[PDB]
């Protein structure tokens, strides 16, 4: 919903492998996922929210079945917040990602003062 009293629907970002690559499984099935994603702000907290993945460019997922992330592949992740979690203008939130192995990283941003259909957080 747009306006000064808007409401965020989803959060999108892309990931890729690092130097000295080693594959990481990106299966998103609720009973087989090994990557956990959390949401937090100063009012509420939810753990193990649901997400979906889309592959861009050269991938081996569309041909056979592969869900490992290896050299040359690029993945897009979407976290849905629409009906259950409420988020609006002028607020700080945190998205936390915990891979089975490697490094744990966070994402801290701040919702703008007027929400439009598509917004950028440089």
């Amino acid at each position: 919903t747009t306006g000064a009293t808007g409401t965020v629907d989803s959060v999108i970002f892309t990931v890729a492998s690092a130097a000295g690559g080693e594959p990481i499984d990106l299966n998103n099935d609720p009973d087989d996922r090994v990557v956990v994603i959390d949401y937090r702000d100063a009012t509420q907290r939810h753990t193990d929210v649901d997400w979906s993945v889309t592959w861009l460019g050269k991938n081996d997922y569309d041909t056979t079945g592969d869900t490992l992330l290896e050299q040359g592949e690029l993945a897009e992740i979407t976290v849905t917040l629409a009906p259950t979690i409420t988020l609006s203008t002028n607020t700080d939130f945190i998205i936390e990602v915990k891979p089975p192995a490697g490094a744990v990283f966070s994402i801290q941003r701040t919702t703008p003062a007027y929400i439009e259909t598509v917004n950028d957080l440089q």
């Binding site: 490094a103 744990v104 990283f105 966070s106």
Partner: protein, 61 residues
């Protein structure tokens, strides 16, 4: 027999190096993000100036 003794000692040094390596990787990621914020933050206000156009007018009741 130093042979099978050394295996126990060797594993201990490997795992402690592993947990240390894990912490460094996570720690380094946080610091990089913060440095990124500062530059983007800095460019913002430098650009944000405003100015006056026209003359000033007062109205007397």
């Amino acid at each position: 027999i130093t042979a099978l003794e050394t295996a126990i000692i060797l594993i201990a040094f490997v795992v402690v190096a592993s947990v240390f390596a894990f912490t460094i990787l996570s720690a380094g990621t946080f610091s990089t993000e913060r440095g990124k914020e500062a530059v983007y933050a800095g460019l913002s206000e430098v650009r944000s100036s405003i100015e006056i156009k026209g003359s000033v007018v007062i109205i007397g009741e």
